[PDB]
Each structure stands twice: as structure tokens, then as C-alpha cells.
From a paper:
extracellular pH, and works in conjunction with a cognate inner membrane antiporter. excreted by the antiporter in exchange for a new amino acid substrate. that it is a decamer made of two pentameric rings. central pore, with the CTDs at the periphery.
for the polyamine production at neutral pH. decarboxylases have a similar enzymatic activity. between the inducible and the constitutive lysine decarboxylases. interacted with LdcI but was not capable of binding to LdcC. abolished by this procedure and no LdcIC-RavA complex could be detected. led to an assembly of the LdcCI-RavA complex.
Numbering used by the authors:
A (entry chain E), B (entry chain E): 1 to 710
C (entry chain E): 1 to 237
The structure:
Amino acid sequence: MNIIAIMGPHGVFYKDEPIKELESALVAQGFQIIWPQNSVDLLKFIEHNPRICGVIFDWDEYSLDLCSDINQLNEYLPLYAFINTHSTMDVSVQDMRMALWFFEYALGQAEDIAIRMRQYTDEYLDNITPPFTKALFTYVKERKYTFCTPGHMGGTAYQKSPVGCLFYDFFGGNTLKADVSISVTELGSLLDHTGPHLEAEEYIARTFGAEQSYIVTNGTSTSNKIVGMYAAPSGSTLLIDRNCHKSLAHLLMMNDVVPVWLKPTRNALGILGGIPRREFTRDSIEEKVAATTQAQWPVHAVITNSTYDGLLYNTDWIKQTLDVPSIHFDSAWVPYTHFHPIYQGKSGMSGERVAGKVIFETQSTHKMLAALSQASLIHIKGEYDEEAFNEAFMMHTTTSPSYPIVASVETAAAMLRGNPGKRLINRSVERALHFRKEVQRLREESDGWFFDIWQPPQVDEAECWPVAPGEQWHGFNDADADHMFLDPVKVTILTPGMDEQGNMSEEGIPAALVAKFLDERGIVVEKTGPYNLLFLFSIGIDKTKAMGLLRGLTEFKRSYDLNLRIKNMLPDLYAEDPDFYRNMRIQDLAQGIHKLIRKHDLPGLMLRAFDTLPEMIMTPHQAWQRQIKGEVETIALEQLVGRVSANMILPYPPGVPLLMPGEMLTKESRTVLDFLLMLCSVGQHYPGFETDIHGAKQDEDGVYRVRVLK
Amino acid sequence: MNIIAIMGPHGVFYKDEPIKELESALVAQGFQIIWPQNSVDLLKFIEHNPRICGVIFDWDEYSLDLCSDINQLNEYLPLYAFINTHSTMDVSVQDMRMALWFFEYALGQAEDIAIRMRQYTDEYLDNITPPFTKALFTYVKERKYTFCTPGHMGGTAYQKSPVGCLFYDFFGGNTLKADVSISVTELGSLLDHTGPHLEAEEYIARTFGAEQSYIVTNGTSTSNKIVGMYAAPSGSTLLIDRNCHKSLAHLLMMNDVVPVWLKPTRNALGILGGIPRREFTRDSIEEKVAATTQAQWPVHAVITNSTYDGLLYNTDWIKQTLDVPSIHFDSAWVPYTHFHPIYQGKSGMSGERVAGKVIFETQSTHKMLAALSQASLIHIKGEYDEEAFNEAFMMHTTTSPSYPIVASVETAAAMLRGNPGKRLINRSVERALHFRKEVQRLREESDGWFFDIWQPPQVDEAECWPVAPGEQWHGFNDADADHMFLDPVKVTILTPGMDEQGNMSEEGIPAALVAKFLDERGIVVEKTGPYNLLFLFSIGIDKTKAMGLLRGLTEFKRSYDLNLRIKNMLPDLYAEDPDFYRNMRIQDLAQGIHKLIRKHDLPGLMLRAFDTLPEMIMTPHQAWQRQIKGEVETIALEQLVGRVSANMILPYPPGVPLLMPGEMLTKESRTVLDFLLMLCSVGQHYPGFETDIHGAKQDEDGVYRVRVLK
Amino acid sequence: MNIIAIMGPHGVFYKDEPIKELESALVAQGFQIIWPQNSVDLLKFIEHNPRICGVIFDWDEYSLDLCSDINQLNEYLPLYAFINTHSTMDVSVQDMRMALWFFEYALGQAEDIAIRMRQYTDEYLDNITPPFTKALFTYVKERKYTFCTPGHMGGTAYQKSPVGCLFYDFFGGNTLKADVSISVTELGSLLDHTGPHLEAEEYIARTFGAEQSYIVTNGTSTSNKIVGMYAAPSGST
């Protein structure tokens, strides 16, 4: 933050000489001086360069032309207005939010003006910077306690080592110095939620419209367990989305609770649909209580809002309808809902309290917004026993917290604050839609096959496009209306291979092939299925990355139609097994893999595998008690029927739990095993296209084993 | 790493010109050239500057004088030897470990020599750098995957914000870029312990003499819970040191186990002594089993080795004697025992396996060595069910691990490796002893009162000085010999106030006064009691810091004897309450606080408070079940007798648990309450000298409340 | 291959300053910067100078006027397009064979952009350079086997002689270093037609529409005799 813009040659020494003296006084204070051509050039310079921290201009020449325009971009931006004798104040000044200092063109005034600019820059920074970070930065820069640990003291210990010196130089001083302890008493304590730490938590809770917010330094994986353990006593019944993150599976292994699963829907693609409205009604739950051994009325419920694929719930409907005292929205996917009105009545925090209920959102701040890994928030809307909740929090938090992680969580909030924050999301929304329109346009214009997007036939509107029963694009049968909506930011592309029905085509290009092509160009794919790929249009995503991906996709088709040798098109793939890939051409590779899917009837097997549930012999907790005594053994996957599984089995595809600890596959549910076996069989043919099943142990000879109770 | 040392003017153009050409070729590659005066100056330059990465010298002039001396400091240091026509190879070369390249003095050879120096520097770096860090650094520097998250991508998202740009600039690029995900597939996975991660874990386990090592990214606070939960099934009995860290108290709240406490000793000062030998004998344990409701034979035992005050156990004695299948040494204080032979048979990992037992050390790598906060190790010696142990590990680890924390844990090992690692600890030991001798010397030489160190009357030896029954310095009665030893690095200083017996003097200077004086000079105190202060002589501690503390101590006495106004000597204290401290002088402050201790008979009350245990009505787990249903209320501290406490109460002093969750103070154990009340009473008089009781809630009016069962 | 052409003064600091910072970052990497007058001057500069390995230009100002014209001369030529906020992608991009990187005008982006230009220049070179020559050049530049012959090793033996030093200097290092043996095992063998040598022969045979091609190192004078002797038994007509 050291670029000052001056706007203009005037052609008079009485004005120019004082500016020359000011240039010299500013260089003495180590400012860089920049000269925008005109008003437009300045506005773009401000818009693109946050380091622009001051503007000098003749008052009469620019004030009536600049003040409103600059206010719109940066309310706080230093203006240094030089007045004429006859300058006056128009009524336009009275109600505008401007930050103006008035200066005269005079020799020997530069020393005082330069000090005022420095002092005013600090006042601007002090206003916009958050309180804890401002204190932290001041300590790191200024402070010198001695007779103190840490013993390394700003990473001093690292510099005494040959490799240590390389390590120190790589990470830098700030990273080393930021590693502090509670010996810095003026910053208070995280664990106590005292001093500046309390100020930080209130800052966060205000920005996100929460009653109270906790900063977690071990990710939402831990945030879920803090909420979960405080909320679910042993021997209680919980309602849990079968579509749950692994951390909730681990929660079950750690807590003595009885799960009753909310049951999602699914289509032919193998994409998960929302928990239908009937799942929340008293009639459905009352019967589930009767059907669960020892079950009582649920004390706590966990709902994933939105779904991974961007299906949002009417949260007003759930809060009003669901007859459970404790409702937890795992909102790790939707931390940005408070920033666009399109999400009204579609987020956990939206609206007011629910009398006699406590409502939670847990959010993974990292890679959902911008924050360091392990940074997570718990947002509470309702009442908790403060002392008891803090005991639960301290039970899972170390006594040696990382102060940078804490600061990064607070600074993540600083990013989303103010008008620049709102203007960021408005920009990302417009770019997300723009890209969707370009895909649909290129699909219409191109000759023969092209990529398509899984969405309404027309998205000429800016909204979370509702799933309508009168539309076939989504491929769900008799969808509930006014229920599930498509988040614009969660973009799913589809590759040729399956019909509109969910029927199989003769010609197909498995998405796995495109994924390998994309890696040659250093493009990450978040999630892939048989014929789909997921991309996340974050705030970091600019027009360059969108065009790079868009052009990269047209280049894939270009090279594909050439029918290049895999050796030439995918050299990194070829290198994996030169003999296997010696004479294979790109079109044969696509046809060969599609043929395996066709022969194995993968889509049909995947549908039938998830249609009937494994039987819950005992709870995951009860089964883990046997495992604690080391009463497990490994069996081949083929010999798992009639055995009690000890681990969760999580196959990719379709990346959702298939078997839980305590469940047993029987003759009734043999299709489950047939799907898993098919994944291991199909996956053995092509180097680089290996099976991927979390919970199964692949042996050197390519046989799989699972753990079961003796 | 860019400083090259050249050693010499020769007075011949045939040698000098080629060196001039080499200087120019090296500057072109951005090396800095340094010229040590002679052999001694070079050795000091190497010793003090790890960035010295090459030495040029005439072979005949120096080889017989340098080779052994340099080998001793740096086995790997580049030598660029310039040969004469008649140079020969003495037998001294044959068995020495040297890294030599031979060059001729010739024009137009510099391009190839310079490339060889670059290539050889990389080969030197490649040899000494650990495998994962070398790959990580190469990725961070070189790599460019696109169509990837994280969305911020090297902190790009931060730069779009005004405050975000300040935040980015403060932390720097490397800190931002190092925030990665598993999308970087070539680095494998932490959670899977695969690829370079397995290589890193084997590197660590080898350096620390463990069977297997796990890297934990939530500190030893979490490492204790991973080991604890895998090790102690519900309804089992554990032996636990009453002198346990808070994380073990939290473990009890989280695990349904029945504690039987090992019972430490204590002296008049209130310093904890070791668990006597009788505590480990079958006779003592057999009776404890009979005395504990529902207890069976202990399945797992936890011992704190060493004690905080540096008492080490004969671990060979414990491993051989203790009839428990699972023994866990919380060795958070002694991670360095593998590096000095003085610790033989005094560490958990020392020696071999114990048939039919599993032995663990958990170590807080940070501030016990040098590593980032939250970095912790679990070391295992024996057999675990690998798949089951990893489930327990994954249950408490996030799905979004911090890659820098992981790298810092590995790099912490890199610091301790090789000959420089051994030469570091040898240096810290010699400095620790040197300081102890200077304190004892100044005590002998000075007129009247001076500081003393709590240790043997003579430490003219380098050893963990054994506590002998024929010595009175330690103030423990009938100490077991060949049992407890004083770690040289753990230095406790004492201030005047109490006799050798543990009797009270008329004159005294409470240590709290000295602690405030030390803060005026930016010296941290790790731990303080009524008349003691603890300092940790880490590897970061140099001779400058030792002298600063030593001089700071003599300055305190100098100013103290002047009897300066507190307003002048302790201006920051005076500012806290100008009216209270207006006319008070330093000697009156010391006398006034000592008088409160004398009147309140603090030492006597503190001894009696810990003599009789609160009664365990129910386990901390059973009591927490009632708290989960919100069946707690707050009572004044004064009204706690006959109530079931809900929280642990941890008073400072003496910083050890006084009451546990589930325990009840009765008329039998009223002294416990009297001590706590005395702490609140004595603590109310002096601003800056407030009561400090974790577990008690101080109200605005200075009344305290605790939580109890209804 | 080190001449970069930049096309234009814009009259705005927000665009010009970032280009100044880029000029400095590029000079640090030892690039020469050249400034063609206009589109025609650029096209002639490209046409006449194969060492032109990159072009910087404002996207909106030139893309619709340049992309087809440049594609016609050099499919592979680096373009460094600087975008405006409102820049869009016309259908003309979809089927054209372009090699585009999109950059923003921003301070402190030059280090990464300059590295991308270096990395992209290598990717361009790697695409157009033949496989064996690319490996050979990399060996000659990078490699250092010891306990090896030839004994002269990069013509070292020549430099020990008065006339030898004149001979070495006349022919140069590359000519001397290129004199290798089969000790460089990663290049395979000519006689065996193995490894990169087989790759080279297939490259040739493809370009000349042959079933199989052999590389002869004693001219067609010998090529005629190889074919002739294999083809004509004694006592035949």
C-alpha cells in the first residue's frame, strides 16, 4: 500500500512547483507516485489495484465529477483536494460519505502535508483493519519480550541448522514470528474467549448473522464433533442424512447413539437427490421410531444443506415442520448465503429463533470462501449452556493453538466485509452465468457432439433455478415443486454416453478420459462420475481461467477428432505403461473404456446396489466395542456375506457410503456385493484407471480384503 | 545459501587470473564471494554461518591443514581444490569422508566449473534435505496445475481485498502457496500414510528410535487422546498420575473409564515429587483394586516422565516391575533423551520391546525442541492393530490437514539430524551448567542476600544429579536413592522468604515481585510459585540471553537496595492503579506482600489443602452424563461443601488439580475449601496480584461461583 | 529465440505501468524486447525473423484482427493477451487452432507471468522440436558422465596443443561435445534402431510417406550399395 496517484499537468508554476515539492517529500517517505491518464484510467487503476491508497486532484476540476464515482468503489480512499480562492461547497457534500482533507498550493507546506497523509493512511487502515489483526501485526512488528518462550523466538533456532536455514528462508520471518503463546497477555486467550479474542468472535458473529460464533482450528471435521457430542447424549436417537460426510461416520464410532437415516433419492446417473418432504413429517418419523430397536423420539437431527450438487432446502419449511428440539444444518457448502438475497429462506441462519429449538450451522470456511486449511466456524442460533459448551470445545482443542490459523479465520471475514465484498460475489455470479450461457451457446452452434450442462434448457435468468415436475432435464421422477433449487455456482458438465432417459448409447466418451486430458493442462477436477465432472467457480476464478477451461475443452474435441495416438496426445499416460499404450489411439481408448461399461452394465449395477440396504445387526458403536478388544480379522471382499463389517465401505463411484460398521450383507442384499465386485473387476484392465474403494485393502496381487468380526 | 569463501592472494598471474575469471562467472550466477583472513577465520565463518556453501583453496597449501578440521564441522561442505603439477595423494585421503572436486587453473574453464559448483551444491542439498520437504519445495517453486482448487490458488483471492492485500503482504507468498490439498497426488496422503508421507514417517521413526511414528497436527493434547481412546475400553480401570495435564482430565470426561490415581509426593515449598517405588509394586496396586468400586486389574497405565521440575525415572525399573500390559509415558517434557547418553535407561524408547506389553511416548515437539505449534508425535514401541489404530487416528483428524504443519514436523527432525545436531545439545548442556556455576559463584561472592538455585551444594559434574537421602537441598524426607534425578536443563531459581526446613523467615521477597521486574525487561517466566521461578534453557537460548538475565537479576538487587518508588522502578505497575501505588516504595511493596503470606500462613494452608483428597461420589464420566442433560447450577465457592462438583478446579498456586468432576468436599476434607478461600482472600488486596483459579468464575463484584449438580 | 514484440502505447497508467514492470521482469530473464509499428510490421517481422517467439497485445484491440492472420504464419506462436473487464469470446475462437494465455494488467503479477512465458516457450519448443534432437541437445547442455570415453571429452584433448587450440576455437564446443559413443545409453543405438533412434526413423518415414526409412551416414553412394547388394544375388541379371 504505497502507490499515490496524481491527476494532472496544469500549466502554471504556482500550482506545479508545490506539487513538485510534494513529490519530493513523498519519495522521502518511500511512496511510489503513479499518474493515471484521466478519470476512467483512475477508476480502473483503483478497481484493479487495492494498493492505491491516495489521490491528489484540483478541487474545482474534479470534485463534481469524481466524488460520487469514487465513493461507489472505495468509501475510505484518501483524497487530497487542492483548492482555488473561489472554491465553494455545493449541497452535494452534505450527505455524501467522503473522507476529505483540504490543502493549499504553497511552498514549505509539504512536510506537514506528508505527515498528515501518513497519519491519515494509518487512520484509514485503522478504520478498515479488524481489531485483533491490527494488534497482532503491531506486536509482530514492534515487540520484544525477553526471558520468554517459545525457545526458538522468531525461528532463531532454525538458522543454526544447514537444512534449517533453507526451511527458514522458504517460509520467511512472519510465519516464524507469528508462532506465539499466551505469554503475550495483551491478546488475551482463545480458550477463554477473552480480550481481543472476544472482539474477534463478535466481529465474525455480526458479519454472519449468528447469535454466537466459535473459531475452530481443526476444521469442520472437528466442528461437527463439538456440536455433535454436546448435542447427543448416549442412548439417544438421532436422525442422520445417509448422505453424510466421513466425519459424521467417525462421530458415530465415537458416540453411543442409535442412528435412524434420512433416505435421499437417486436418479439413473447415480446423482443424489434431496430428502423428500415426507421424511420430515411426523407420520414418517413416528413409524421409524417404532421400527428402530430401543429408539425413542429423536433429540437431534442433522441435515446437509445444500447437497453437494447444489440442491437447497426451504429452511423455513424445515424449521417450522420438523418436530425435533435440536436441528443441525451442516452448511459446509453454503457459507456465502448471507450475501445474496436469492438465498432468502434457504439458509440455516436466515430469519429468527425457533422457540424451544437450537439451530446450528457448521461451515468449512476454507475452500468455501477464502481461509487457511483447518479454519472452521460453528454458528449458533438459540441457547446453549455456555460453561458446558466451552468444556466440550476445550475437550477437543489443544493447549498449544496456532495463532496464524486463528488470525486467518478472522482475516477471512475481513475479505467479505463492506461494499467490495458484495461487489465480489455479484461479479462471481455474473461470471458463473456467463460461462453457463457460453456452454449452451457453443452446444447450439457446434457441428455434431458437444459438452452439455446438467441444468434447465434455458437459464436466461439469475436465480437458483427450481427443479420443476414439468421439466425432464434433472431426470428425477415426480420431483416435489417449491422444494429443491440449483445453486448457480455449482457447475456440472456432462459427457456423451447416456440418453435422456438414463438409457445407454452405442457411442460414448467416459468423463475419465477428459479428466486425464485436463490434467495434461493442469486443471483440477473436484468430483467425477462415469459421465460427469464438477467445477467450483470460486472468487479466485477469473475470466482467464474460465476461458482457459473453455478453450481447453474445444482443444480436446479438436485433438480427439484427429484420432491422435495416446502416445502423442496423453504422453504422461503412455509413460505409465508404454507396452499397454503403444499402438492405442485416442478414439480407441474412449471406445474401449465405454465398451467395458456397456459389457459390465455399470449404470444398471450401480442403481441396484443402492436400492436395498445392508442389515444393521448392531450399531457401529457396539461393533467398535468388539474391535477395541481386537476381535476382528480380514476376509476377502468375496467372502463378506453373512459377516459383520467392521469398517465403512465407501466406493468411488458413486462416492457415498454403501456399508456401515455393524451392518451385514445377506442373500437379501447380495446386489451390494455384486456392485463392489464389478468395480474391482472393471478397474483391473487399464493402467491409470484403477479401482478406488475406501475401506478395502488391495493386496500386491490385486486381491481385496475387508475387516469383519470373528 | 550463496556465500562462497576464497582463501588467498598468491602473487602469480597464472593462478590469480583464473580465479578472477571464476569470480566473474560466479557473480553471473548470483553468488556472493567472501574472503576469510585465514584458517581460523574460515572455521568461525563456517561455524557461525550455515549459508557458507563452498570453499576454494590451493590443494598443497591447505589440504593437510584443513581436511580433518572441516570434516569435523561439515562433512558435506563443498571444497574446490586447485592442484599443482606435482600434487600427490597422501594416505590420509583413503578413509576420510571428504567431498572433493579437483580443478586446474586455466582460462575458459570457468563456465564448466561454475555449472559443476551449481550442480554439486544441488547434490549437497539433495543429500542433506529430507525427501518430502525437497519434493514440497520443488512443487511450490515449480508447479502449475489448473482446473484446481483451492479456489484462492496461492492466496490470489486475498489480493482482491484492501485489508486482504495487507494480510497477504504480512504473511507472504510461501505461506499462501503452501496451503494445498490432496489434488497434488504425487505427494500421496497423510491419512493414508502413503508415498512421500510414509518416507517422512520412517525418517522420523529412525531418528527417534521408534517402531512406528505418527505425525499429529493438533498437538500432543490430541496425541494423548488418540493413544488413550485406542488403549482404554469403556468399563476398564486405568492407573493415572494425579499430576496429569488438563488434556488427560478432558480424556476422562470423554471416556467411560474408572481412574485409580498414582499418588505423588510433595514438600514444604509445594513442589511435586515422584511417585514412590511402592506405587508400582503389585502389593500397592492389588489393594487399590480392592478399594475401587467395580475395579478390575488395570489394563493401561499413564506415567509422566519426567516430572515438570525435571525428575526422571529409572524406566528399566518400571518396564520390568509394573505388571500392566499397556504402559504410556507422557514424555512431552523429554523429547531430547535420545541425544545424550546421560539419559540411558531414563526414557520410554530406550532399550528393546517388553514382551506382552505396548509402550508409548507422546511428545510435544513444539517448545520441547523446535517445531510449529500443534505439531506432535506419537511414538510406539510394540504391536498395534494397524487398521484399527488408523481408524482411531482418522476419527480425530480433519479431512483438510494443514500441509505446512506436516512439513514443519518433518523439518523439525531435519534440525536434530547429523553431527551439527549432537554439537547443538552439547553446547546447550555446557551453557546450562555454566549458568548454574555462575549463580552459585555470585551467591558465594556477593555481600548479604542473593538468589540461589534449587540443586545440590556442588554441581561441579555434568550429569542428571541424583537426589540423595544424605542431602537436604531438595527438602524431601527419606527420598528413594537411585530413583529420581535432576535434569540440568530445567533450572529453578529461588528467592529469599523460607528457611531450609520449610519454615518462615521474618524477611522475604516474594518471587511475584521479581517476575514483574523481569516483565519490564521483556523476560518471560514459564512457571512461578510463592518463592520460585522456572526458566527453560532451550537451543534458541544463547550466551547473550543468559547474560541479559544474569545482569537483569543483579540490576533488580541494585534498584531494590536503592528503595526506589514503585512509580519509578515499576512504571507499568503504577499505571495500573496510580492511587494505590502513589507513595509505595519497592522495599515496602516486597514487605507488604510478604506480610500477607505471613499473616495468611499460605505455605501451611497449601500443605494441608493437598493432604486429604475430596471424595469421589461418582466418576467424572457419570457426572458429565448429568451435565449433558443440563442438570447443573452455579453456587458460590463458599457453598460448595456437600455438593457434587461438575468442573475440575485448578488453582495457581500450586498449579495442580485440587478437585475433579464428580468429587465432593465434605467436613472431612474442609481444608481443601479453606485453601481456595484463602487464595481468593489474599488475591483481592493488590492490583496486578489477582487470584487465578481455573474452574472458578469471578463476578464483577469479585465473588466466585462454581458449577455443581442440582 | 529471445525477441518479444509488444504492440502499443495506450495512454493509460493502469495499462502502461504493468507493461513497464513486465519489461523489467523480462530483461531480468535476458529477453530482448522489440516494438513493431503495427499489424503489417509485425507480420513481416514474424515472416522474416524465426527468433520471434512471443507477442503481447490488448485483447479487444487486436484479437479479431490478428488471430486468423497469425495462425496462418505460425500456429504455435505465443500470444499474451491482456483483457478488459468487458472482454468476451466470439464464436470465432471455437474452431481456430490458437495458443492463448490470458493475463490481467496488475502490479506484482510479472514474476508469475514471466515464468509462464518461459515455461510456455519451452512447451512450444517441446511441441515443434523433434524427440531425438530435443534429447540430444538436453544431454549436450546438461550431462556429465565420468569414467567415460571418448578420452578427449568435449574436445579437452585439443586444448592441450598450440595448433589444437586454434582448431578447437575454429570448430567450437558444440561440434566437439557432440562427438559421443553408445556409452550414452538413454539415446539407444543407431545400429539396433532402438529407443529414440526408432522414434527418429518413424518421424522421417511418416514425413516422406515410406513404409520404413533407414538413416545412412556415408551418403547415397553407400545407400545404393546396401539396396543393391541385398537385392542382387551373384549370377543374376
